[PDB]
Structure formats: structure tokens, C-alpha cells
Design a protein around this ligand. Sequence first.
Ligand SMILES: Nc1nc2c(ncn2[C@@H]2O[C@H](COP(=O)(O)OP(=O)(O)CP(=O)(O)O)[C@@H](O)[C@H]2O)c(=O)[nH]1
Ligand SMILES: [Mg+2]
Length: 414
Amino acid sequence: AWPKVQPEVNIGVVGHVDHGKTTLVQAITGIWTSKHSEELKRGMTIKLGYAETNIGVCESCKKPEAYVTEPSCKSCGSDDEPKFLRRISFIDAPGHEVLMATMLSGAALMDGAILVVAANEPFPQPQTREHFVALGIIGVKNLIIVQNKVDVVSKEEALSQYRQIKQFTKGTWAENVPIKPVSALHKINIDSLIEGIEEYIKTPYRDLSQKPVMLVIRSFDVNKPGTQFNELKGGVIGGSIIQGLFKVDQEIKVLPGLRVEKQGKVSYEPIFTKISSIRFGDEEFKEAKPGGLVAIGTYLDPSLTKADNLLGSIITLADAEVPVLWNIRIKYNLLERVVGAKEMLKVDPIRAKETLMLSVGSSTTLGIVTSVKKDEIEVELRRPVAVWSNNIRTVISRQIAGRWRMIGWGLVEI
Ligand SMILES: Nc1nc2c(ncn2[C@@H]2O[C@H](COP(=O)(O)OP(=O)(O)CP(=O)(O)O)[C@@H](O)[C@H]2O)c(=O)[nH]1
Ligand SMILES: [Mg+2]
């Protein structure tokens, strides 16, 4: 039988709106990531979606068909159990331009990524470019480009687009990134994509001695409405461990923590709690490592975790030393152009007093520029940000025509 383990690797799925990201995740895992009523109603991804699958291989069968996502080799005529390789999970990002920040948040949790490009739309669309560049900046460079929807165009049309994709990636870090043509909807050529995932998105080395840090993207409770008070389960916090590992019964804290109101005055205080449970998908565990999206059960009042209240927080062990900053200095670089805009636009230099959006880990925060130099800016933040390490990358966005657009990136200087 196959072991029940946590996913050991996170693969982002990104790309322009409606290019088929969520359907691709479904093709691979059997799961539809959109769980929220607003997502199902509007027919779009809004929150980061999530799905897991085991990956195995039928050792006595031809590849790529030999790769499977379930413990059966019958499709290649064998009754032998396939060899288990690893469990993997997908971080399914929204494609809508208005949701770029969510993509940025998700990118902090990715070990590698799939850029989905629809074969029946002109390449390169605005969020194809924006998501691509964001991946480059954040360092998610174990990339596979998936040409999706090949079922509705001829082979030669798909090939014309393939040539365009090679041209686009030529001279960039992605020059030799593989391109896999598939139909996510009708499940065509999926095995080849699985093989590509095994080949090009290998599980990275994890130094489990590092101080445990988790980036938070969800928070909620499992309390059915009309639940008795003596039955109210504690709040649950969801996210991905980026370094180290957590264990049941550990004393932890959420940073920056809770917003505190003292007659108009607002500060933040760390939330201290204890891990009462650890879950990945449907399975419970005693410890949680990088890879996968973990649900940490706590003793927190569920009101504190309700409705993703803690999105953007980090979690550490209670005694960790972590700067929680209301002002940050960033060593920055600007892009030449606003890549996510429909019409070509130059990036104006950063100006003092302008309000920028900073993406740091899973957090998204507005701040006012208080100092501008050639290589550095200083920013007064509207809400504080937890800075758990010395070389954290931030992505900088500017509001252009009412839309937040990525314009640059930097290193948060300690
Ligand atoms: N013909 C065809 N249609 C597809 C394929 N993959 C997805 N679609 C269709 O495209 C539409 C959008 O699919 P969806 O998977 O939700 O795309 P998405 O990129 O996740 C949308 P968002 O950017 O908001 O998250 C749906 O109608 C879906 O059935 C494909 O391989 N072939
Ligand atoms: Mg989607």
C-alpha cells in the first residue's frame, strides 16, 4: 500500500484569467480547488486554491504513461502496485488582474510553478507576463510552461504559439523551461505533464534545523452553526511552513498578531497559543514540515481566526525573536515597464509621499515613501510586518488607473 504522508512540495499554478489553471489542477488531482460560494457563483478563483495528490510510477511500463496519481498500474496492463514517489500539492492562484496581490502572496509558498498559457488566446497576455515576471523576481524558477486548451486548435496553431513562447523566454532565466501541451478539460497529455513535474520540479532540500516559520494564508474554525459552547472547537490557522518544522503541543505565536484598539489608537500585540492539532487535507499528523498547506489547530477563541482574519501573519515558536516593523528600509530595483498593464507603460521613479503596496511573505501592506534614494527607499507602513530573516524579498506595486500593478522588487534591510 501507499503511505499516508504530508505533501513534500508546493507547485504554484499561475497564468492569465480563464486560461485554465483550476481545471488543470482538477485534471491532475481530481479536485476542484474553488470552495468559496462567491468563487462558485462568479465562476472564478478568488482565494488561493489548494489540492494534493500522490505521484507514483509503474516501473515495468513505458513513460510517460507509467506515471500515475493513484496506486494502480492496470492502465498499462499490470496488477503490480506502482512505486510511490512523493505526495505533491498545488497552490492555485487567481488570474484576474485585480487579484495580482493574491498571486504574489501565493508565490511566497511555492517551491516551483506551472505557468498556464491558453493555446487559443494571443500570447503573451498581461497576466501571463505579470505572473511570469513575479515568479522570476520571487525566485520560483523551477518552472514548467503548460500550453492548455490545445483541444480547440490545430497542431500547427499550437506550434505557432509554441514558437512565440520560446521567443519570449529566450534571453531570460526561463530560456530552457519545458513547454507541455495539454487539454486540462478533456484530460489529454496529462501523463507527460506529470513526468515533467517529476523531472523539472524536484523536491528541494529542507534544512529542518532552521527556526520554524509558517506563512499564514487562511484562518477559520470547524464549528457548525448552533454549536454548544462547551463544544466550540478552537480557531484554526492555515498556511505553509517555509522553514523548519512544527509539532503538536508547541507553544507558538502569531505575528504581528492582534489589532488592539485603545480609544482610536491602534497597535499590534503578538497572539500566543499552543498547537492542539496538525492536519494536511484529510489526514492528521504529529508534525508539519515544508511542502503542502497545513491546518494548525489552536486553543484560540474562534472569533480571532474567523474569515481569514489572520491572512498575512506568520507563525513562529513563542520564544523566537522576530522584528515586527512599522517602518522598513528596502534595497530596491524597478522594472522598466508595467508588464501587467494592457497598454505599454513606463514605470515612473518612486516619489516621496507616494503610497506603495508591499508584498512580504504572505502579507500585503500599504505604506508611504518617507525617503527615496537610487538603491533604497524607506517606508512608513500602515500596519506592521513580521520580518523573520535578513534577506526577505518584497514585491512593490503602484496604483495605476485604479489598479495595483507590480512595478519593482527589493530586499527588506535589517
Ligand atoms: N476547451 C478547453 N477549455 C478549457 C480547458 N481548460 C479549461 N477550460 C475552460 O476555461 C474556462 C475557465 O477555466 P478555469 O480552469 O476556471 O480557468 P482559471 O484560469 O482557473 C480562471 P481564474 O483565472 O479566475 O482562476 C472554463 O470554461 C473551462 O472549462 C481546456 O483544456 N480546453
Ligand atoms: Mg482558477
